[PDB]
Amino acid sequence: ESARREVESQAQQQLERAKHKPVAFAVRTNVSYCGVLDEECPVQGSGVNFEAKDFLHIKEKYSNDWWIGRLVKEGGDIAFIPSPQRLESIRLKQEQKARRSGNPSSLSDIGNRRSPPPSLAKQKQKQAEHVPPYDVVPSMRPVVLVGPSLKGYEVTDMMQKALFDFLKHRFDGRISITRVTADLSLAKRSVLNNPGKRTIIERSSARSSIAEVQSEIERIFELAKSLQLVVLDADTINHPAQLAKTSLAPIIVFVKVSSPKVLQRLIRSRGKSQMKHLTVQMMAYDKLVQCPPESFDVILDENQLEDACEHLAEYLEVYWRATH
Amino acid sequence: SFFVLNLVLGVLSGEFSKEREKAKARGDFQKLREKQQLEEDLKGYLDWITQAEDIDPRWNRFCRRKCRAAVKSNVFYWLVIFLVFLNTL
Numbered sequence: 001e002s003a004r005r006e007v008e009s010q011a012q013q014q015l016e017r018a019k020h021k022p023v024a025f026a027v028r029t030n031v032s033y034c035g036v037l038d039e040e041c042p043v044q045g046s047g048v049n050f051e052a053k054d055f056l057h058i059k060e061k062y063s064n065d066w067w068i069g070r071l072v073k074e075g076g077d078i079a080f081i082p083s084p085q086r087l088e089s090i091r092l093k094q095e096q097k098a099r100r101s102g103n104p105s106s107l108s109d110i111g112n113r114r115s116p117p118p119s120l121a122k123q124k125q126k127q128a129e130h131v132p133p134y135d136v137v138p139s140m141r142p143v144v145l146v147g148p149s150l151k152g153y154e155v156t157d158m159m160q161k162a163l164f165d166f167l168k169h170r171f172d173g174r175i176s177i178t179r180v181t182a183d184l185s186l187a188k189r190s191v192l193n194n195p196g197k198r199t200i201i202e203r204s205s206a207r208s209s210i211a212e213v214q215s216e217i218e219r220i221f222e223l224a225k226s227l228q229l230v231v232l233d234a235d236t237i238n239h240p241a242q243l244a245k246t247s248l249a250p251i252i253v254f255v256k257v258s259s260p261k262v263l264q265r266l267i268r269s270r271g272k273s274q275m276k277h278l279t280v281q282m283m284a285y286d287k288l289v290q291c292p293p294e295s296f297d298v299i300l301d302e303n304q305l306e307d308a309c310e311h312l313a314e315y316l317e318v319y320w321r322a323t324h
Numbered sequence: 325s326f327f328v329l330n331l332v333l334g335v336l337s338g339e340f341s342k343e344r345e346k347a348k349a350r351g352d353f354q355k356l357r358e359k360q361q362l363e364e365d366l367k368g369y370l371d372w373i374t375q376a377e378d379i380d381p382r383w384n385r386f387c388r389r390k391c392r393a394a395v396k397s398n399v400f401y402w403l404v405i406f407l408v409f410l411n412t413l
Contacts, residue, residue: 162372257369265366304371
């Protein structure tokens with residue numbers, strides 16, 4: 001069989017000649033399916049059963065069928081993932097051979113209508129929410145620093161200044177700090193057909209912040225090619241619910257204030273004029289401390305800066321050396 | 325005087341343990357337990373404020389950015405201890 005042998009090693013040579021190829025864009029998974037019965041690749045790998053929302057970025061513009069790329073981990077080896085169009089056409093192929101998938105039943109009732117299953121059990125309509133295949137994030141994941149309370153309010157944002165220096169003033173080669181006065185919480189890119197781009201076009205969505213909140217995406221995503229985490233000081237994220245839905249989905253670090261009793265002297269240490277809102281200070285903190293902890297990836301319940309900033313440092317110490 | 329005293333000490337020391345058990349069942353040790361950790365955190369979180377109280381985005385940061393380190397760099401420990409030793413001398 002000369003046909004299989006001649007092109008079997010095509011992927012075994014083209015993925016190592018450019019061992020210094022620069023990565024771009026990104027991939028996040030939603031469905032983890034094996035490759036024993038679904039190999040269909042010259043790579044001859046076991047499969048793509050890595051995980052849901054896996055960490056890997058791809059830029060190798062291969063054919064319109066499959067995309068061989070790189071997996072970011074302790075070792076700088078290569079990997080392989082299905083094409084976004086390949087997953088869409090095959091996610092139902094596994095269910096294609098599921099006999100009664102359209103409407104008939106096997107409960108001793110054979111011969112009622114028969115006929116092939118209707119086309120609705122395919123990609124002809126698939127109109128649940130028009131969820132696309134694997135989406136794209138920046139070259140690394142963005143960083144959102146929630147806690148201890150509503151940001152920009154005296155004590156709260158000043159907790160962020162203390163830990164800041166560290167990260168940036170510790171890499172200077174992976175950190176490009178930035179500030180955004182943009183409402184990320186009400187920002188979503190699942191627009192129907194087109195977001196607002198003009199200024200005086202006299203449309204129903206003309207005088208809206210959507211146009212000026214999408215303008216900061218170009219500062220993220222592809223702009224992160226310098227391999228920097230890109231922090232933000234936006235006073236919009238107070239719960240890991242609104243932001244962990246769209247393609248942004250940044251790393252959320254929650255500064256833990258332990259029991260909600262030590263926070264009393266933390267806020268009242270300034271005396272007067274710190275209780276203009278009063279109530280919103282001590283349960284917006286606990287709101288975060290309600291949602292599935294999983295949401296935020298790094299919990300910072302620790303003492304004076306010398307040990308808590310290490311927790312942040314060790315999280316990115318292995319992370320920065322794993323993305324190359 | 326050496327056996328009666330032993331009896332009295334034993335009875336008192338076994339009697340003081342029953343109330344300890346009753347307090348443990350009621351849970352009076354928790355109040356001391358929480359006060360220790362909360363005070364530790366209420367001091368363990370003040371560094372965030374103090375280390376960022378002098379953020380410079382007049383220039384008193386010239387000293388405070390190193391006074392905090394210098395007085396806590398295991399030098400002012402063994403030097404103040406030496407001065408206390410000299411005072412005791």
